[PDB]
Amino acid sequence: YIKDENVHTNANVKPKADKSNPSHIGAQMPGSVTEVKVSVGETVKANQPLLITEAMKMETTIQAPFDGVIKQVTVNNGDTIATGDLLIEIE
Amino acid sequence: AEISPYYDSLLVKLSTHAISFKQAEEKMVRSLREMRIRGVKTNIPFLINVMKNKKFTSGDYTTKFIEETPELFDIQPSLDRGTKTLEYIGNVTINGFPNVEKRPKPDYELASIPTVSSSKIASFSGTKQLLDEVGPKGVAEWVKKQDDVLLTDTTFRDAHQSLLATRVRTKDMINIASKTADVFKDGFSLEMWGGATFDVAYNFLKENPWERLERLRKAIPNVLFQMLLRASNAVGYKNYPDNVIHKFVQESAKAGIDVFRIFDSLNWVDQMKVANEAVQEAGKISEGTICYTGDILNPERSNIYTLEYYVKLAKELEREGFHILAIKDMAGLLKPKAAYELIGELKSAVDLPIHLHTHDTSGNGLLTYKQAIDAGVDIIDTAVASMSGLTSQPSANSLYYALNGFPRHLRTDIEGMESLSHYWSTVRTYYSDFESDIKSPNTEIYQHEMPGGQYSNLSQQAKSLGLGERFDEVKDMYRRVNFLFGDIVKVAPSSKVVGDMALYMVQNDLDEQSVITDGYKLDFPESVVSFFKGEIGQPVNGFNKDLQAVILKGQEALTARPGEYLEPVDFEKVRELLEEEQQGPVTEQDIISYVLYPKVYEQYIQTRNQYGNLSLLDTPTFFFGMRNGETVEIEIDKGKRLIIKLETISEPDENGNRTIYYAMNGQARRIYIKDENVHTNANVKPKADKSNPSHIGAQMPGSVTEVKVSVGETVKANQPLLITEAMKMETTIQAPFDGVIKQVTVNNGDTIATGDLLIEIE
Amino acid sequence: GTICYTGDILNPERSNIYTLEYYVKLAKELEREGFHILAIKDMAGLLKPKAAYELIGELKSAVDLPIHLHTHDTSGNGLLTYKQAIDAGVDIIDTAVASMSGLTSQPSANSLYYALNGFPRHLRTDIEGMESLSHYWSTVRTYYSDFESDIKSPNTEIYQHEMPGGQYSNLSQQAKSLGLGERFDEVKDMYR
Amino acid sequence: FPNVEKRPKPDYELASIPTVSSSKIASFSGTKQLLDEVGPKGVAEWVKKQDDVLLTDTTFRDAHQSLLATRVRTKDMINIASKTADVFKDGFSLE
Amino acid sequence: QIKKLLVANRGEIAIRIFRAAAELDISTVAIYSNEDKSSLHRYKADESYLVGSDLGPAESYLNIERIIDVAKQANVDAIHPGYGFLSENEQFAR
Numbered sequence A: 001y002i003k004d005e006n007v008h009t010n011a012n013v014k015p016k017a018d019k020s021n022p023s024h025i026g027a028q029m030p031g032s033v034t035e036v037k038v039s040v041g042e043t044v045k046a047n048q049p050l051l052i053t054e055a056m057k058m059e060t061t062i063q064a065p066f067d068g069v070i071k072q073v074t075v076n077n078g079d080t081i082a083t084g085d086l087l088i089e090i091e
Numbered sequence B: 001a002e003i004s005p006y007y008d009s010l011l012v013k014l015s016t017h018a019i020s021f022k023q024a025e026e027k028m029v030r031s032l033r034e035m036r037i038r039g040v041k042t043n044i045p046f047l048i049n050v051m052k053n054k055k056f057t058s059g060d061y062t063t064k065f066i067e068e069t070p071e072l073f074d075i076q077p078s079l080d081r082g083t084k085t086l087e088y089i090g091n092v093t094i095n096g097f098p099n100v101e102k103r104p105k106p107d108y109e110l111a112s113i114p115t116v117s118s119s120k121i122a123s124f125s126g127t128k129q130l131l132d133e134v135g136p137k138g139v140a141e142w143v144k145k146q147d148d149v150l151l152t153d154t155t156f157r158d159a160h161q162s163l164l165a166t167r168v169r170t171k172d173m174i175n176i177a178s179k180t181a182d183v184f185k186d187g188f189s190l191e192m193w194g195g196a197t198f199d200v201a202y203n204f205l206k207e208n209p210w211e212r213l214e215r216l217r218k219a220i221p222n223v224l225f226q227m228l229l230r231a232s233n234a235v236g237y238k239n240y241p242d243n244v245i246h247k248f249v250q251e252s253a254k255a256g257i258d259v260f261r262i263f264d265s266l267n268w269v270d271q272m273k274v275a276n277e278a279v280q281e282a283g284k285i286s287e288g289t290i291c292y293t294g295d296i297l298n299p300e301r302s303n304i305y306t307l308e309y310y311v312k313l314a315k316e317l318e319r320e321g322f323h324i325l326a327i328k329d330m331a332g333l334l335k336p337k338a339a340y341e342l343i344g345e346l347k348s349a350v351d352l353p354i355h356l357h358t359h360d361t362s363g364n365g366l367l368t369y370k371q372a373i374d375a376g377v378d379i380i381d382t383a384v385a386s387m388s389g390l391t392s393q394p395s396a397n398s399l400y401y402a403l404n405g406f407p408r409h410l411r412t413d414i415e416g417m418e419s420l421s422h423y424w425s426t427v428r429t430y431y432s433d434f435e436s437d438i439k440s441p442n443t444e445i446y447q448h449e450m451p452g453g454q455y456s457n458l459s460q461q462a463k464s465l466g467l468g469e470r471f472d473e474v475k476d477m478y479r480r481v482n483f484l485f486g487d488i489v490k491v492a493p494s495s496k497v498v499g500d501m502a503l504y505m506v507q508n509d510l511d512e513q514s515v516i517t518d519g520y521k522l523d524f525p526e527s528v529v530s531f532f533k534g535e536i537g538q539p540v541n542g543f544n545k546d547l548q549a550v551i552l553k554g555q556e557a558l559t560a561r562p563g564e565y566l567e568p569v570d571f572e573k574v575r576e577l578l579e580e581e582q583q584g585p586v587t588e589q590d591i592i593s594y595v596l597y598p599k600v601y602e603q604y605i606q607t608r609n610q611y612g613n614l615s616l617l618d619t620p621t622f623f624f625g626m627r628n629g630e631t632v633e634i635e636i637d638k639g640k641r642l643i644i645k646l647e648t649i650s651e652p653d654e655n656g657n658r659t660i661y662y663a664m665n666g667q668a669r670r671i672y673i674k675d676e677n678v679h680t681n682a683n684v685k686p687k688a689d690k691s692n693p694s695h696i697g698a699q700m701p702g703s704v705t706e707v708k709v710s711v712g713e714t715v716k717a718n719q720p721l722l723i724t725e726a727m728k729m730e731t732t733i734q735a736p737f738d739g740v741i742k743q744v745t746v747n748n749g750d751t752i753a754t755g756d757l758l759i760e761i762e
Numbered sequence C: 001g002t003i004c005y006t007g008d009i010l011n012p013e014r015s016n017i018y019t020l021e022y023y024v025k026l027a028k029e030l031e032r033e034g035f036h037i038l039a040i041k042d043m044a045g046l047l048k049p050k051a052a053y054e055l056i057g058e059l060k061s062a063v064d065l066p067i068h069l070h071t072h073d074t075s076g077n078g079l080l081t082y083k084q085a086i087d088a089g090v091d092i093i094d095t096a097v098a099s100m101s102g103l104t105s106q107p108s109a110n111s112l113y114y115a116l117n118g119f120p121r122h123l124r125t126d127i128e129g130m131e132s133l134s135h136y137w138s139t140v141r142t143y144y145s146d147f148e149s150d151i152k153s154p155n156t157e158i159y160q161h162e163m164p165g166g167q168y169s170n171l172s173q174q175a176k177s178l179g180l181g182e183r184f185d186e187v188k189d190m191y192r
Numbered sequence D: 001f002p003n004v005e006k007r008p009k010p011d012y013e014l015a016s017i018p019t020v021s022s023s024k025i026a027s028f029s030g031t032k033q034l035l036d037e038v039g040p041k042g043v044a045e046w047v048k049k050q051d052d053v054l055l056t057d058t059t060f061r062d063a064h065q066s067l068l069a070t071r072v073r074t075k076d077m078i079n080i081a082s083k084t085a086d087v088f089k090d091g092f093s094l095e
Numbered sequence E: 001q002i003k004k005l006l007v008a009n010r011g012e013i014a015i016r017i018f019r020a021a022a023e024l025d026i027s028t029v030a031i032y033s034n035e036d037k038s039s040l041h042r043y044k045a046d047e048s049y050l051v052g053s054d055l056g057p058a059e060s061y062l063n064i065e066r067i068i069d070v071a072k073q074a075n076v077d078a079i080h081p082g083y084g085f086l087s088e089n090e091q092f093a094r
């Protein structure tokens, strides 16, 4: 395993979300990550903004379904996403 | 080439010559008015004022002419219709349109448009001529005499409000207006205003709904125009004082609305008095509406929403003096047999003609109409085939044929409807990005009773909260919430309340008992607390006192309809503000539009100023702009049209600004638009002038690792002002001399090439 | 034994061949052949509601065979035809799950189940089960989106051209794939 | 793959697959059983007597021939077979 | 007394007549044919109308009826025939 030194910035392949897992939050539409608002290890409340995306010049803000803890953030600002990619895992 | 400040400013010297001072003077202003220069400001309008001046044309003037004549420095602003059109198309072409899948402008089916001569239309005498003839009481008496079933078409409003998020533009409506006028010559009315059209017109499509009314009015002068009016707030989004309802009605009537379908989202008659009165003062047809819920066939459904409830309610609307009774089955709950029993009873109980509106979301829509017809219904709401079905109205085309061999005929022109259907099928193609999720009949309607669109909207919403796998529980909860709140009529905004509450309860593991037990420490959704404060009005059964308490946390609830609480709006003040904010020409339609939708209206204007009348664009162009080599033909008026050809788009400059090369009818033309690249690296940097001491260039291909200076920074020689990346190697670019930075050609992460200009220092 | 339905028994100008008496005679003939059941196959969804009532009304008298009706909902009058067939005494109808119904398919069973509420005859089936199947097919259908028909609305012109089930969209492609896909108007008229 | 828009594997919603046990279904006695006991003519006789309208489902045949060019695969039918056995236990037939 | 002018012609003469009308505050109307949907005189008037899709190339500045049909649909008080078309035509003037 070798880290690629920012020669694509966003062409990272996101693992797809297990749709039968509540802790898995997946992308509902293709689009771009506008702002990562939380990082790994942080405690969040329900309905808290975690992430802002931009699909077709329209901004949706992705929120926490339940009170819990962020265990993996899959994206960075500016990364593109496709329907079904895992974005966040919270318990 | 640009202008240097080192020589006296001479753009052009202009000279005119003719038989008389009068003719040369008018030769001058003519050439002055054709003059157009941009990128810099000119003394053009000044001279125009000078020439026009009677004292100049007099000849008696002296040197003191300018100092004594103060009108010469009072010049009017110069908009340009054409440039702003080019600006819009340019923007959308490069940066796409919101919610429209960024794709090359599609090559749709041509499908040319059927039209009818306006002199023929002018000879038609339909239900509009009948209103002008016998008044609103007389139209009603005429209706109940008609053996044929009269239809209202909903293609211009409800049909696309259901299937296309109300995005259908005026342009496509005006295009078939003349054909529609002939097709529905014997129709009762066309539903072409109200619901979400007001809101959506101004906000999303950025077009004046009043223009849509007015233009359709001229084009279809023979059929009654109908709008849907919500009793509490006409077509707004909040509550309003009564004088806002009145104004909007008076001005709606004036611009061509004849039939107002008035409904309360709780079937609360008292909240329907204002709209009623207002419509009556306007001498227009006021349609009093019962919304349908429950199931009169099934005695276990409710002890409230029974046959006797609807009869009682109907007779109250009759004593209120509505000319027509509407049944609004906003969720398609009226089952075939229910229709026949409800209408039959309603015919016997009241003398008003009955106007029936249903959605086809269960798939039993036509059966319901057929049964309603059998029971004697006077009017039904239909749509052309291609704009019908599912959450829309039942199809008119098929109702026509479904009736063959039965004792009652649907009075219309099928031949015409087939044609209208074809037109609407191609046009619907333009709106593919706004197509409903729903592609199938749904009989779970009969338990959860979600109106119109919602059972998809709420699924979208439920997926957002991560309950996508548990939508059945949401649908289950929606139904329980309905009983928890006392069994209520569910249309906007009441149905929003129940959906919000349902989402809220599933998300919070809450049932009917815990919602009361834990309610002291629960922040209930604003829509429910609002609903329990009395702000949508009174639900039939009232509020449960303990449930009200727990949600209100001690706030008072209204003791009367939301209306009686608010001050009348000072409309003179509204006019004062608008006339200051804008130019000068302000109207009553501007005034209530502001009142009803302040923020939206303000935004419509900022868009009108920047881009002009977008509603005149054909829909493909409006959503996609233009491709290379394409020519589009924009109708401004009869005899006035802009022929635009997009020739090419250049690469972006060092600012992400791209240059579009247009031809606007005979003329070369260049426009600039900032391109939001999504990341930055594709920008074309100017080549540094090598024999110029100010210009610093790039020695190697690389990246901009860090930017350290901007426009207007003064530090000594040898300052580390820009860090680059050669090939995994950082080189710190330093200034040759003490000076000031004029331009920084790059930002962090931009790719650079050999001999590219980066920095200029004095 | 199947009788394919064309024409319109409601309209005496449509045909002096495909009349009620033609259908009765054909039924009595198939009964004579010893078929256990009489199917009416309405392949182009041309059996208008009142025609269904009359045809099935007349066929029940003429023969002792139970009647099995099959229509397509391409005109959007599917359910009406079924309801009218049921009033006439029809024994068996061909339906499909809501998410697999409508337009060129058969009428929605789910819809018919409720459509008949308040009426003399009940559809023998399990709606809760039908709702549940419907959801399943709604997702599965999604795997087949590259095979979706272009048809997204009912078409009453079928009464003019009588094109069966699929054909209409099929035949349009052939016309496009032959540089006539503009003037499909004259093709429709030529078919007739 | 033929007639399929070359694109990355599309995202699909999860299908909850409702399932009935094979013993519960082995206990059912429907129109299949009637044919074995009474024959074709008896089945016809039994039909004529029924008040309820009977139905034949076409999901597995004429529905997807109409809507999806007959492309529905065995696998998708096989997965709900056991639920279908239950839902249509009182049906006349399955096309 | 003249409010609107129509020029039953094309090219330089049309533009010329337009320019005079404009200098006299008179509103201008221009006619054009199929291969003249490009010709510059079309764009130099306040209003521009095609003389019938049907009508060909040269014949479309000759068609007396269709040109008058246009003149009505705009409320035109006056036609300037220019030179070299209907400019000498008796029937057209009557």
Ligand SMILES: *C(=O)CCCC[C@@H]1SC[C@@H]2NC(=O)N[C@@H]21
Residues within 6 Å of the ligand: A057, B091, B092, B095, B096, B097, B098, B203, B204, B205, B206, B607
């Ligand atoms: C991207 O935003 C390009 C500009 C397109 C603006 C258009 S005008 C009407 C629509 N409403 C809106 O807010 N933007 C769209």
Ligand SMILES: [Mn+2]
Residues within 6 Å of the ligand: B158, B330, B357, B359
């Ligand atoms: Mn509606």
Ligand SMILES: [Mn+2]
Residues within 6 Å of the ligand: C042, C043, C070, C165, D062
């Ligand atoms: Mn078939």
